[PDB]
């Protein structure tokens, strides 16, 4: 409960959220699906 | 009138307190 | 028309007042 | 310099209250904790029926003998009731203080409810709720209870089903009246030219025989379409605090900012720990969208840019206005029952200032984001509602992307 | 304190009563009702009584508007037949500019083109929700048909009115009916001392006696008005006593010996003479009451029904029968004490609010410019005795009567029937 | 000074067209509302000489000298209603800004 | 501009003051995120690499 009000019911801090979890996002899926790409070939 | 029946039953829908909104 | 914004019974047995100003209320009693 | 208000209370549990100024006719009244909250849907319009029949007669005074009696001496019997709250109360003369407390004695217990009556009686009330029916502000304000509080007896209405009203009979109201009538649940009201200590003998000596024996809102939408109607009328409204939270103040002063549509008022309806703060506005069918938008925004505002200006004259219109009320006798009296039934103390004028004046801009916007902002509403709309927005138009409108 | 009265030279009534309120309220009352226009201005008194948010000389619409809602205070106006009254209140603090606002717009209006060419739509819009209940409407055609000059104008504006009253003819009538001889200025809740000072700053200026009005004149008839409604409403009045006799005190004994109200919610209301006699032969459901309006000059009582509209008949004439047995001296003195009791408390109540408290003391002075201690009327009503409330039954009974009638009127009887 | 503006009111040329001064003001939200509170004659000399200057610049013509609008004759009627105009819109927008 | 050096005008702003600021810095992110601004990357602590 306390991150709705914290991070997600303010939609300024909504977007903070999205954006600061996609810029690392990127980070983590490329990553992942990298081992997981080498691991199949 | 405007009271002779209840609002229809959504126990099938409603999920099952402030304290769970914001959870929810 | 439509009375703008519509709503006694009571009979009338005085004689009627009309009342406005500022405040949005405004309304006739006998 | 306002008169406190004293609170005795007798070995029944009716707290005797009075508060004596130098008018000289009087506000004497009796407020029972028993509304429709208190009913189970099998009783459903007792507290009602029994409202009507209180007055047609008791065993010591049968009949029609019983309101010439109120006639005699030229005061007033009125009697309401609310989903929490029942009164009886007669507006009178100083020197008749004593013959009218006699008068409620009897009007709260040995009442008399006649089978002759009672058939009188279901037809009237039958009849009134078949043309209630009519009063579309009293329509959409039910409809907001229901869809507000589904599943709960507060959904229900005061009057009841035309059912219940039909299959009613002098055990049941027996019982509603034996059952909801108890004596620590009882108010003695006085206001005016009455004397405390006069009251609290004439308590003790009548009506000192009076026997001492998961709330929930929920964010939804009910709309009756019926385009034969000319005018709309739309209630929005989300949970309110209760009548012991003491932010209601400070919402009341956000009322009192806001104050489009032809008609546009903002109510704060309190119930024991729940309540109902919102807006209905009476509207031609198109103009209603344009409207829920204005008014979306305006709480928005106050969520998000209260200004201390605004705050101040907010401030103004609420000292002015429970100041403006509890002026007459009646008013008064009334406050003294609600507050002796709702807080257990009369909270006096200087209390109610001091919250007042306690009050700033920071703590409205922080205590309107906390009631208003991100909330699910209840929408009730009756007439030509098609261009009213649905569920999901009006929970985007409870919040900004701009915050 | 008591209340406490100056005359001023001019002729400005002052009176003031310091009770320490919280609240307090300022109004100022004017011999300008409806009454005093004619033929050629029919309706002004409306659209003054609308006015009051307009642009004065001293401060604009939006500064009186957004001031007096600054603080939280009220500004009304109620208007009858005779009088006028702009009533202010709020905190104590404020009622300075409370006072600037009130008396600039009294005083000094400039009753701009433009802005009364906005508010004739407003106009139209209060006529309809005044007259959206049939009591208002039977009532002003009582007086409409009872008579023939003064007090048969209308207090609200006639439809063919709306669009041709102008800036010019409201100039007219405040400078002819808004002088200081006219006009008392009551305070509850404030010194006696400020109500003088704004006395002469203002309300001095305009010191004439103004335009006299003419004397209203009997006519007698009936107006009848075939709408189609559920309901018959019925209104049979003839001429009786004017303010300042003790044969008003007599009628409004008369009224409450008839009956003037439901005391008890749901009652039957089982005293009513009226009520008693319609209901011992009629089982439909009716709202049957006496009528009593006086003014300075002349005064109109009667009866009142509402009723179903087949039995309409009967019933108006069971009322009528039972003010007749009033007239034949059938009456029991316990039934006329209960009657001045119940007359006497209504006064008291009406006089316990502060609103109308102010009023109060306001007509008094705009009437007899002394105040009447509420003890010193509960004798005088005393004073009227039964043989009093018979005398003015049969002036009733026997003076022309003026019938106004609403409804689905094909059994509703005629006055040369009734 | 009284010359040069008598000077600067001829090069300016709407008396040519039979104009006065505050018809060629540039229709404003507070020059629509002071338009708006005219009297009916003065509102309707108004669009009469409007409609009158668009006609004589369609057919690329000016009025006769003796029916120019002459600088002393010329009546600024609209001024004093817009004044209020922007006074009573100072007013509101101070009472805003506190 | 002469209404908007108001009092309440200031009151309004300053109100308006930390909602502006988030928003920037949605953006900021964004940008050094989407354009991978990789003055700004780099120094983040994990999604370094």
Known sequence: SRLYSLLFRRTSTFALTIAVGALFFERAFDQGADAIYEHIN | ?24 | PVLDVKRSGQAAARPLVATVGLNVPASVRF | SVPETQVSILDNGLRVASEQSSHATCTVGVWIDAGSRYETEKNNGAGYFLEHLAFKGTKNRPGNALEKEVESIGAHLNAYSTREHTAYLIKALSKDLPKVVELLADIVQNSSLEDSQIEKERDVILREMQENDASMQNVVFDYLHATAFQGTPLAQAVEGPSENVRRLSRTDLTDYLNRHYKAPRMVLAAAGGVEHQQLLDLAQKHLSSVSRVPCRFTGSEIRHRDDALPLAHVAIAVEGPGWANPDNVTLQVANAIIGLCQSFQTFNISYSDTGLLGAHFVCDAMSIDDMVFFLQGQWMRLCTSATESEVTRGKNILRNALVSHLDGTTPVCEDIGRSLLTYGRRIPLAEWESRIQEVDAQMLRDICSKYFYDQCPAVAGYGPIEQLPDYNRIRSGMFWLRF | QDLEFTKLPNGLVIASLENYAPLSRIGLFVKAGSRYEDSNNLGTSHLLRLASSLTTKGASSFKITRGIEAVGGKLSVTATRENMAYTVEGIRSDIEILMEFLLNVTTAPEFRRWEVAALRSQLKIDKAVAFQNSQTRIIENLHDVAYKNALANPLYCPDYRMGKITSEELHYFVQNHFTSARMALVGLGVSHSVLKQVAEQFLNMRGGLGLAGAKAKYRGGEIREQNGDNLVHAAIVAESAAIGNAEANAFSVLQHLLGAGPHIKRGNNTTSLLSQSVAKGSHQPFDVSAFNASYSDSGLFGIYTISQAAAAGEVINAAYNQVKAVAQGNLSSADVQAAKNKLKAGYLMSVETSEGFLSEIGSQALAAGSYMPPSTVLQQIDSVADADVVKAAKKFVSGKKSMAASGNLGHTPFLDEL | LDGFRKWYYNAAGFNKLGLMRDDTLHETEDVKEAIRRLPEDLYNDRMFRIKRALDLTMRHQILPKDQWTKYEEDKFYLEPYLKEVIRERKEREEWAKK | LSRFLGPRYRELARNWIPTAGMWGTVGAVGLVWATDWRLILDWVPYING
């Open chain 2, 1 to 24: 009138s405007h009271t002779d029946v209840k609002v229809p039953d959504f126990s099938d829908y409603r999920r099952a307190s402030k304290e769970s909104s914001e959870a929810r």
